[PDB]
Structures are given as C-alpha cells and as structure tokens.
Amino acid sequence: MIKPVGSDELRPRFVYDPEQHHRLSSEAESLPSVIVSSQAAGNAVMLGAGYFSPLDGFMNLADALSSAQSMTLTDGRFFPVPLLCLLESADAIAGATRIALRDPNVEGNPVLAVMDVTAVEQVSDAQMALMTEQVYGTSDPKHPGVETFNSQGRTAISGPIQVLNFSYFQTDFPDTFRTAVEIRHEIQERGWQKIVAFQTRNPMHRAHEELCKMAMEAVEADGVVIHMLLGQLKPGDIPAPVRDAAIRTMAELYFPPNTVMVTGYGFDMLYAGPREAVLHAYFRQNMGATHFIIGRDHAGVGDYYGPFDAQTIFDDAVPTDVLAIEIFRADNTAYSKKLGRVVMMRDAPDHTPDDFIQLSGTRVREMLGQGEAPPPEFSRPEVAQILMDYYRSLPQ
Amino acid sequence: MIKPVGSDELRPRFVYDPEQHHRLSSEAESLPSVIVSSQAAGNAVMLGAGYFSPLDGFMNLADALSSAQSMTLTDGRFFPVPLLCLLESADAIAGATRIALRDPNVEGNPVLAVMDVTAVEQVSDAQMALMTEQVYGTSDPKHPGVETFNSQGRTAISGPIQVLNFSYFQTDFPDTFRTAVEIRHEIQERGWQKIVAFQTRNPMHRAHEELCKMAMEAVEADGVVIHMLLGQLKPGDIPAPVRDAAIRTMAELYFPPNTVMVTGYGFDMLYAGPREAVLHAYFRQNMGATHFIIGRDHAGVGDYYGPFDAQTIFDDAVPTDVLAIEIFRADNTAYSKKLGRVVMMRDAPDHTPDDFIQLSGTRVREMLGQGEAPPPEFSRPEVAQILMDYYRSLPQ
C-alpha cells in the first residue's frame, strides 16, 4: 500500500475505543464549550477520519502562517493549508485547558470533539491578509473561500483534539460516508495495487466515466475510488439517493468486476484552485490512492486561476518527494466519430474539429429535465432513466 | 444477486433523502414521544438498515401471534419472530396518530424513529405466554431472552416507522457497522456470485478461519462476509477496534485477494436458539449472502435446545420455498495432530482428546497477556501479535 503522508500508519483522531468514547462523551457534557464554524467542524471531521493524518488538531498562528506561505508546519512537517479554529471570542472558555467543540450543522449543537487548549491567540489584520492571499491566491472579497475564511472571527484556539462523531456527513449518508482508515482497509483486501481516485459531487455521464477508464488504462490501475463530496444540497444539485443510484448503476453495468469503490467524505470546499488541489492529493494518498485525476480548472472559482495551474503547482511549488501519490493530468473530452469512443481531445492530434461531437454537462442536464435521453455517446440509457424519472417526479 | 426475502428490492425504513430526513428530525422534536425498550430500538435499527425487509414497522398483535406460532404474518409473508414495540402504558402518547420513538441507549434519549400509530393493544397473559413459549421454546423465567421479552410491559403499539439514525451501533463502530443495503452493494462491486456469511463477536483463530475456508470450498464461494454482532462492552472484553484489527489481519494475510468482507450489524441477541437461527438466515439473505454457516448450539443458551436443533429447524419447521439462502451445516472445529489440519468434530469421532491441539479461552488470553503466542496450529503469528500488542500496551 502507498504510505500515509508523514508516517508509516494513519493516526486518526476519532475515539475508536467504545469505552473511552463513552467516558469522553460523558465528560464533554460538563466542559466549557464553544460552537465552532462549519470550516473548523469539517477540519475536525477530516482529522477524526484520518484524512489529515498525522496532524493532532488545530494549529497555532505560527504553524498556520508557515502552512499558508510554505505548505509546512514550524517543525517541518508537510501540510498544504492552515487548519484553524477561529472564534469571535474565547470568553466562554477563558482559562479552561479542556473544552468541548460543538457542531454548528446539527440541530441543538451536539458535541463533535474534545480539545486540550494549548494556546489562545488574536490574529492581526496583517496576519489574516497574509494567510488569505497565500491560500486563495487573491484578496478579492468576491472570492467565496476568502469571504468564509475572513468571516469567522479573529481568536484562534489551538491544541490536540479527540473526535466523537462525524457530524451529519455520517448520519445523512450512512452507506457512502467513509473514513480514510476504512477506504485503506477495503483497497487492501480487494487486492488493488494501483488505485486511481476521482472526485465528484454529481452523477457521472459518459465523459467522466471514460475519463476514469482512460486514467486506469494509462497507469495500469486495478481500480478507481469515486470519492464523492458529501454536504448540504446546493441549488440544482441531484439529491443524494438519486445521485447514488446513478453512480452505482454506472459502476455495476459498465465497469468490470471488482474495479469500482463508491465512497464519500465531508469537508467544506475552499474554492482555492491549485492550493486546494494539493490538499486533495494529500488526503487521497492517506486513503490509499496511488493516482489522482486533476483536470482543467480543478477546485476553481471565477477567473482567479489559470486552467492548468492546479496541475503545474506540483512541478515547482510542492516540495520534492513530500507526496508519493501521482497526478493523472486530464483535459476536455469529446466523442470521436473516427474512433467511436470518448477521448481527450488533446490526445487525438490527428483529428480536425469536425471529427468530434461535443455535448456539455449542462446540455445533458437540460435534456434529462425535458425527459429526453441524451445520445448514447454521452449518457448511458440506465443512468439517463434514473435522472429522467427523478425530474418527472417533481411537482414543478 | 440472491433476491431479498418477500420482495424484488430491499425496502429499508431509513430516510435516505437528506432534505426529508431534516424535515422529519425537526418535526419529531415537537411530537408526543416515548422512550422504547432496548429490544424495540434494536428492531427499529434492523428495520432502518434493510435487514428486516420488506416489513414497514412494528406488528399488531394478530401478526405477532402468527409470526410466533407459524413464522408468518397474517397476510402470509414469511417472518420468523414477532417485532413488537411494547410499553408499560400508552399514557405519554394517548390519542396521537404520529409520535417520536426515543432511544433508551443514547444519553439524552434522542429520537430514533417517527411512527404512525395505527393500533394500540393490550397483550393478555395467555397471549404473552403463547408468544413466549413459541419463540423461545420455553417459558422458564431463567432464560435471559424470556426475561427480556416479559420485562417490557403489555401495551403494544403498531404501525409503520421512518428511521432517522442507527443508534450507537454506527456512532461507536463507524468503520464496521453496515446496512443490508450497503453489504448488497459491496457484494455487487466485488463481483461475487456465491457468498458465505459467518457470524462472530471474537477474534478468529485458526479453527474459525479454516471453518470459513471449508464452507467456501464446499459451496464454491467467491467470498465470505464476516458479519459481527456489535453491541455493549462487558468487563474484560477485548476492545472492538483490537478485535477488528485481528480479523482484518487474518483477512489480509491468509485469504486470497478479494475474498473477505468484514462488517457488523446492531441488534439485541434473543438467545432463542433454532428460532433465532431462522431469523439470522432471513436477514443474511436480505444482505445478499447465498449461504450461511450454522454450527453447534447456534444462538443457544442453557439446555433448552438440542446441539443441532438450529440446523434441523430448516428441515422440519421452515416451509420450503420461503428462503433462497442455504445452510452450511457446521460443528465445532479443532486442529487434529493425527490429520494435520483443522476438522469439524463429526469428521473425527475416532479421535481422542489428545489427538487435537486445544487451548481454553482463559489459557489463550492469559498467555497472550504474557507476550506468548499460542502454537501456530492454533493461532496465526500475525493475529496473535495484534492481541499481544494490545495486552502489553499501556492501560487506559
């Protein structure tokens, strides 16, 4: 198995021993407590689930400044983004060395983690601006990741945490949410030696299906982990049950036996483009993937990043040999009339534009909503049917 | 895939649509509510998870009486034990049609399910005694299943349920708890056509490892699902994560690639021997297993059942055609020095006790405590090492 990043074994922060879990849960009900931001809560779930191994909790300001500017902690460990717990005020936990962190995204704000607080620090305007410009590559308040980061308050609490649950990501998505620990176990047992990871939050049509297959053939992979971003439903997104049925139907009918793992994780998007792509590679190595697909404008928003910056950041900016996972560099696909299959256009230089047929993800979605199956070059009939049945069911 | 029992597809009671799940959770806080028994909570978890498919909720008295005496509901569907929600009284919910069921096993007694109450019935002494003697094979109050059944009150509430979570089973055991739905999907991903199910709660030593391999060879299985009963700890128990690590090490080193799934489910044991064996077969068919291992004194307690009664029940009490799943009829196993392999006892009646390598449970745990591995005919060195590491690790 590919090694975890920075250690020989994953070091998750979830309390796996049930007796210790029960004792901590009991203790937490009498501790001073704070409700954290959704960003900090996601950071805690990722730490609990082993995705951010081998880190122990939330960063002090020196580690956060070092991570933002250089992708390292002060002690030299590689980690690509700051992991901060920022609050409007630390008054409720003044002088406390042990506190409960409560979940902002579950009714009644239950305890998510217990934290040993080793520092409480105020972040200056200059420190915030430095971290913002370095992580997000802009100072524009129109950038949604910039706005969230700067909307949490300026008191940073730092120290190691013990995670008691995985929030609504597990409760709402019980069949798909997986820890990095369990994805690594499952890769191991299924016998896969090379494994491609692919992120999505919506149904996969033929273009994305074929991109996974191209990547698998190129690197001689034994399997693909489809790693779905779980979270609250965004306007125009496909509800989870329908999305899951579409992905699982594609996997069962169009891939060979024992080649697909359908899984998911919970973490708020940063919209940080090339910097977020490094974070993605980091946690995918932790879960056991050997290859990670990065296409055009990966993790991007607006016009802040160049189309392939998230690929090239791995050439220069990421320190040599900190990561063992390799990038499969994807690009736009089209159906080749000459070859009778979906290809990356860049890899068919013998073709003229007229040799391709193109149909966007937007156009596919429009057709499905009108009850018209897209051409079989772009959508599988059984996947199309699942989506058409969904759109037809709506009162709209 | 083997068909679910009594339908073409599983009909779980969990609310998979997150928006509907959120709406119901919010509604449930304002409903009349009752804290159910641990048995009823377990029933709801199994119903939520698809294991008791195609049932919609708790049974009325007529169905429970039919299930107890003939393993069928009044409409003729096969189901082998009553699923009752018994209460001391309906006072907390008098008159309400829609109610919240609260979990007795989680601090705070959170909502586990929402229920539409379609009947409320008093269970007579005669009705209770008939169900008791039929399900458990005895009316002895000293049988622990009998005692649990008769300690819940006499008001049965019945009607369909919608399940909001899987109680402490998923929270405490996030990498191993699985629904019947997910197990069936993973069996599909892995491409298995014949699948053996084996239940255990403990680490698997060479005797259980080879029992599973015997079963797989006999039926030409592609894989085995190790389906662990998850629950509450008792003093002296090996922690769940150590037990899982021992089973995963065996799976990774001693079984071929893509042959083992390590999973768990949550339910309170009935100790009903042969009747509980029929229930195990039922839910293992629903999870997608084609064969189920039943050894000696399966689900037994006391001296109420014959040592192979849990196998022979399928011959003379279970209607043909109701189950598709097949039983692998096992027995206790041990390593024979005369033969040089693990054997079931019944293929070795000629052996004397000195022809086997056998160690008591106390002997094994105490020698592992001292950093001593059992002989390699009894334990794999790598599995013994997991256990020894736990016993020699700093306590707490």
Numbering used by the authors:
A (entry chain A), B (entry chain B): 1 to 396
Describing publication, verbatim:
In this work we report on the sat encoded dissimilatory ATP sulfurylase from the sulfur-oxidizing purple sulfur bacterium Allochromatium vinosum. The genes cysDN (Alvin_2448 and Alvin_2449) encode for ATPS in an unusual sulfate assimilation pathway and the gene sat (Alvin_1118) for an ATPS involved in the dissimilatory sulfur oxidation pathway, respectively. Dissimilatory sulfur-oxidizing ATPS was found to exist as a homodimer. We produced the purple bacterial sat-encoded ATP sulfurylase as a recombinant protein in E. coli, determined crucial kinetic parameters and obtained a crystal structure in an open state with a ligand-free active site.
